[PDB]
RNA sequence: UUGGCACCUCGAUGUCGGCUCAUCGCAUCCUGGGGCUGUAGUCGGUCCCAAGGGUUGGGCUGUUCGCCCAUUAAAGCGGUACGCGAGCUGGGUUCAGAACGUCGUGAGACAGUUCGGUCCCUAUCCGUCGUGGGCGUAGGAAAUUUGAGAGGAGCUGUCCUUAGUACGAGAGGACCGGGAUGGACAUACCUCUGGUGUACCAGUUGUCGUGCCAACGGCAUAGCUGGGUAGCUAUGUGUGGACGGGAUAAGUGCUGAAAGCAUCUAAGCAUGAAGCCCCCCUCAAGAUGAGAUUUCCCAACUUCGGUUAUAAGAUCCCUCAAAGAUGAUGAGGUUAAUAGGUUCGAGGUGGAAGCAUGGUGACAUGUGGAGCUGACGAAUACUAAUCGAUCGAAGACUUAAU
């Protein structure tokens, strides 16, 4: 359950090492988000270099959360850390790799380049 | 279950003390609520007594207080010994009950329905 | 038991081809993933963390490490989506729920066989 | 079109055709009997009355609703039935497809209908504005003394009164609620149980009036 | 939070219409014939 | 709004912002219907009908306001003692302390700043939210009820399709309808995910005690720590606002004359909105108009009912919870499973005690998923609902049919 003022790790090589969120897109009054949902956020720790630099405002997608998700069969997938990936306003990543596991529910959101450039779909 | 207008430690203590005293006297006078709540505790202790194996003895030692009864002819024995030698035999064939309750009229200082809980 | 009518109406959904295990055992659960246009199988491997009330309502949890990122999947025990469960190896624990593995990584999360 | 009186037993789960977890409630409908056939010229509206369960027969010196009273024995004996415990009626039904004295059986429902279950809610007793009415309560710190009470009950001199409908503390529960567009997953004819997808109102051991969606 | 006016004798006597003690639940005792409370032990005799 | 007047209030009408709760207008911010346009459709602008619903989260200031950062379909304007302090705060302002700048010879002063500065009240009445008793409904009762009325909902996004089609040098680009998913919000429920679970299980520290080791109890926030049943719960699970009628608003017409033409109008007759009415959910015969259906009860003294006691039915009393502040509601009272206990089981905890083996010891292993197990499921009268008491009909006239 991700709301504004929540710090997330970036799971990509965009430059951003860790970021925090401002809004959850998707509706007036929308308050929370889970895997497959986009958020506006501003990086707080960048790598020296990288395409994204510290203090920028960026669109981003949640790829793993500690709250996790119910699946239609009564199966639940949970994780040990929140995480996110930056996007280029086309459901495409800004970086060239992607670190760590990803949840299968991103397949539906048509974040296919995120699902294709991933260590483990789950 | 009931709380008896009292905390947890003070109730645990009251219930076990009241059960011990009942075992000593075989019939006591108290208020309905506490009779209704000591019924189960004393009934379960007698069950621990209908087996008499060392495990049940050790386990029933948890609840009973350590008291001494002077029987006829200056014979002395404690609450555990009474439970396991004078009350186990009496209810070896009965498969429940073990206690009855006889409502009495309200007391004077309060409007509490005094009752007499007795070992049957 | 539980209510008899609950137990009767849901007895047909219980699986019997399943093995017997306990928390702490590391195992391989196989799952029919009907992703794409194929019913593939993904051998999920983890350490059982807990399991809950009987009936169709029993659910068990398994924990693993993917890329240094802990992942846990709860599965209903009698889900028809599980092809098979192999207790790949036994485990000597002293709990019934193993929540205390969410803070350890590496040899600290060690388990003795049998 | 269809209607059955039942009682709620609990909830469980079933697994669906594609693996989906289905949340379900077990309802027990047994010996539902028609006791009358209301008619437009006799009573002004056409409908049928169904009795559910089974009370015991009259006894002299009864002290509980367990046994039927003389008034009820007579009503049920005119339908050659045993005294029943819960009696309701249905209007949506075609009165001419039923006969005074038939059994309404669980199999009236097939798998995949759309039904409305009407029961009574669980009692929460006397409650306050935050649980009963969903009100945001006040600050818990910063020197507040307004934790859970409801706020202003009105204005000032204009309307020197509290208007009707002001959401204030009191009893919660004990209200008839109709959940709509539920469906039945299976009907079992031997244990006499209609399984309904979702959850229904009421305490365990209650009463539900299942009939066919009006929408 | 103070009475804005007096409660007349009429209002007073009206409010306390339902303020009364109920006659006790007493039945005659089968061994002695004296009255006892129902479901309690007779205090005159000591029976059932 | 800034004012003017000084009419109620100085034997006191708390004044600003914020919080909680709203309620009403419409000169409408979005959504619905239209006339238009210097409208090709998307675009926008303008005006009309529309108040049913909806009409964000933050940074900065005590701020209202305003600016800014992200969103949204929109982030509307006002009334309500600039709504609401016997509902809350008290940052600003307006007591006493202090300090700076300025004015004053001075005491002191400034609507100039600045730091600090006690928010009392057990609700009588009306009002409002729930919940009982009495009586009336021309007999006394048990159950099922129609609905005069009343209340609640009423919001809307994106994607796909038609279609890259119409319309477009192009660039761009649907209308309709027809599918699919959301946001917010309201409800019901605990199966699942979790929360809590102070008479459940387990580990452990200090200390006192049952002489003693071993076992256990008291105290230390439940001493602490890991779990956790029932119940109660959301952030969890379903469901809902779906159709569809009838009358309309601005508007669009048809036939049609006064005024042989015309012309939406005067006769009449069409169509047309999230608006009106119904439709959908809930309460509802104290609806004193007191309604309807089925059933049950039905004598015998009067000296004339202003009549006992009894039916049918309840209650007293008592065991209880699916109900509960109390009373009510509901499950039960021996011809009995209502609760307790007993027996079995579910779920929870996790390998009891005592033995035997191994170790110098701290310990480990087998017995034995053992032992324990509050509310959860079933059976069993073993214990308690033993005895008894109280209340409760005999049915009015008048007229018309019979
Ligand atoms: Mg005055």
- Pairing state of beta strands B99-106 and B76-78? unpaired
Give the range of the structural domain holding residue C44, as residue numbers without chain letter.
Answer: 1-114
- Residue A60 sits in a domain whose CATH number is 2.40.150.20
Residue E14 distance to chain B (closest CA, Å)? 28
- Residue E36 contacts residue E27 (beta carbons within 8 Å): yes
CA distance linking residue D143 with residue A53, whole number of Å: 43
The token pair that represents C42 in the structure block: 């993904």
- A120 and chain C in contact, CB less than 8 A: yes
Partners of residue E37 in chain B, C-beta under 8 Å? 105
Q: How far apart are CA B88 and CA B82, in angstroms?
A: 9
d(CA D84, CA D35): 10
Q: Determine how many CB atoms are found less than 10 A away from the CB of residue A101.
A: 24
Q: Which domains are seen in chain B, by residue range?
A: 1-120 (3.90.1030.10)
- Measure the CA–CA gap between B115 and B28, rounded to whole angstroms: 8
Looking at the structure of chain A, the number of domains it has is 1
Cβ atoms of E47 and E29 within 8 Å: the answer is yes
Residue indicated by tokens 């009470």: D149
Judge contact between A65 and A79, C-beta under 8 A.
yes
Question: What is the resolution of the experimental data for this entry, in Å?
Answer: 3.6
| CA distance linking residue B28 with residue B36, whole number of Å | 13
Q: Which residues contact A36 (CB under 8 A, 6 or more apart)?
A: A61, A62, A103, A105, A106, A108, A109, A111
Residue of D nearest to A75 (CA): D21
Q: In the structure encoding, which two tokens stand for residue A86, read together?
A: 């930056």
Three-class SS of residue A43?
Answer: strand
Sheet of strand C82-89, all strands in order from the earlier edge strand to the far edge: A69-70, A76-79, C70-76, C59-65, C40-51, C26-33, C82-89
The residue in chain D having the minimum alpha-carbon distance to the alpha carbon of residue C33 is D19
For C26-30, the CB contacts below 8 A with 24+ separation are C26/C88, C26/C89, C26/C91, C26/C111, C27/C62, C27/C85, C27/C86, C27/C87, C27/C88, C27/C89, C28/C85, C28/C86, C28/C88, C29/C62, C29/C75, C29/C82, C29/C84, C29/C85, C30/C82, C30/C83, C30/C84, C30/C85
For A55, A75, B71, C48, the CA distances from D149, given in Å and listed in that order, are 44, 41, 63, 47
Query: Which residues of C fall within a CB distance of 8 Å from A77?
Result: 71-73
Looking at residue C100, what DSSP letter applies?
Answer: G
Q: How was this structure determined?
A: cryo-EM
Number of domains forming the structure of chain C: 1
Let me know if C98 is exposed, middle or buried by CB neighbors in 10 A (0-12, 13-18, 19+).
buried
For residue A79, how many C-alpha atoms fall within 13 Å in the half-sphere facing its CB? 28
Q: Are strands A101-102 and A120-121 parallel, antiparallel or unpaired?
A: parallel
CB contact under 8 A, D15 and C10: no
Provide the 8-state DSSP code for D72: H
| Burial of D202: CB neighbours in 10 Å, binned 0-12, 13-18, 19+ | buried
Helices B8-25 & B32-51, crossing angle to 10 degrees?
Answer: 70
State the residue for tokens 């296919």.
A112
**Whole domain around residue A10: which residue ranges?**
1-122
Q: Which residue has the tokens 């009503």?
A: D75
Kindly determine whether residue D21 and residue C76, on different chains, have CB atoms separated by under 8 Å: yes
Q: List the end-to-end C-alpha distance of chain D, in Å, as a whole number.
A: 12
The strand pairing partners of A84, in sequence order, are A10, A62
CB-based contacts of C14, cutoff 8 Å, min separation 6: C55, C56, C78
To test the contact with chain D by mutation, choose from C3, C5, C80, C81 the residue with the greatest count of D C-beta atoms within 10 A, namely C5
Which residues, including other chains, have CB under 8 Å from residue C6's CB and lie 6 or more apart? C55, D9, D10, D12, D26
Token digits of residue E16: 């306390």
Rg, C-alpha atoms of chain C: 15
Domain boundaries, given as residue ranges, for chain E? 2-48
């Amino acid at each position: 359950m991700i709301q504004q003022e929540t710090r997330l790790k970036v799971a990509d090589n965009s430059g951003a090492r860790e970021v925090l969120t401002i809004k959850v897109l998707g509706g007036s009054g929308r308050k929370t988000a889970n895997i497959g949902d986009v958020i506006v956020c501003t990086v707080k720790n960048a790598t020296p270099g990288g395409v994204v630099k510290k203090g920028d405002v960026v669109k981003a997608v949640i790829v793993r959360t500690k709250s996790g998700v119910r699946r239609n069969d009564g199966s639940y997938i949970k994780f040990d850390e929140n995480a996110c990936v930056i996007i280029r306003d086309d459901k495409g990543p800004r970086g060239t790799r992607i670190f760590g596991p990803v949840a299968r529910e991103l397949r539906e959101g048509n974040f296919m380049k995120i699902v294709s450039l991933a260590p483990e779909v789950l | 279950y009931r709380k008896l207008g009292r905390t947890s430690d003070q109730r645990k203590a009251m219930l076990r003390d009241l059960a011990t005293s009942l075992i000593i006297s075989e019939r006591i006078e108290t208020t309905e609520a506490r009779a209704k709540e000591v019924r189960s505790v004393v009934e379960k202790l007698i069950t621990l007594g209908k087996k008499g194996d060392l495990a049940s003895r050790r386990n029933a030692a948890k609840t009973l207080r350590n008291v001494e009864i002077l029987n006829e002819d200056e014979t002395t024995q404690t609450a555990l010994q009474k439970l396991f030698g004078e009350i186990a035999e009496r209810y070896t064939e009965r498969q429940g009950g073990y206690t009855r309750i006889l409502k009495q009229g309200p007391r004077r200082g309060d409007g509490a329905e005094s009752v007499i809980i007795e070992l049957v | 038991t539980n209510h008899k009518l609950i137990e009767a109406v849901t007895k047909s959904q219980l699986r019997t081809d399943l093995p017997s295990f306990r928390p702490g055992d590391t195992l391989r659960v196989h799952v029919r993933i009907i992703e794409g246009t194929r019913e593939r199988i993904q051998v999920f491997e983890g350490v059982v963390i807990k399991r809950r009330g009987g009936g169709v309502s029993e659910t068990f949890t398994v924990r693993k490490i993917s890329s240094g990122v802990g992942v846990e999947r709860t599965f209903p025990l009698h889900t028809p989506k599980i092809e098979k469960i192999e207790v790949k190896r036994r485990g000597k624990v002293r709990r019934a729920k193993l929540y205390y593995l969410r803070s350890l990584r590496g040899k600290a999360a060690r388990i003795q066989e049998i | 079109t269809k209607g059955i009186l039942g009682r709620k037993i609990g909830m469980t789960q079933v697994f669906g055709e594609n693996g989906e977890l289905i949340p379900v409630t077990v309802v027990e409908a047994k010996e539902n009997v028609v006791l009358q056939k209301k008619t437009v010229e006799v009573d002004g509206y056409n409908a049928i009355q169904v009795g559910f369960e089974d009370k015991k027969a009259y006894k002299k010196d009864a002290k509980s609703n367990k046994y039927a009273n003389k008034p009820a024995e007579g009503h049920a004996k005119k339908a050659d039935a045993a005294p029943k415990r819960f009696i309701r009626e249905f209007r949506n039904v075609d009165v001419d497809a039923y006969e005074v004295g038939q059994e309404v059986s669980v199999d009236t429902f097939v798998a995949g209908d759309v039904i409305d279950v009407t029961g009574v809610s669980k009692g929460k007793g006397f409650q306050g504005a935050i649980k009963r009415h969903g009100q945001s309560r006040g600050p818990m710190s910063h020197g507040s003394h307004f934790h859970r009470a409801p706020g202003s009950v009105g204005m000032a001199s204009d309307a020197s009164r509290v208007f009707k409908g002001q959401k204030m503390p009191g009893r919660m529960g004990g209200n008839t609620v109709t959940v709509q567009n539920l469906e039945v997953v299976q009907v079992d004819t031997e244990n006499k149980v209609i399984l309904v997808k979702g959850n229904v109102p009421g305490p365990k051991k209650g009463l539900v009036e299942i009939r066919t969606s009006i929408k | 939070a103070v009475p804005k006016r007096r409660t007349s004798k009429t209002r007073k006597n009206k409010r306390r219409t339902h303020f009364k003690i109920s006659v006790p639940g007493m039945t005659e005792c089968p061994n002695c014939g004296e009255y006892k409370l129902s479901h309690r032990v007779c205090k005159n005799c000591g029976s059932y």
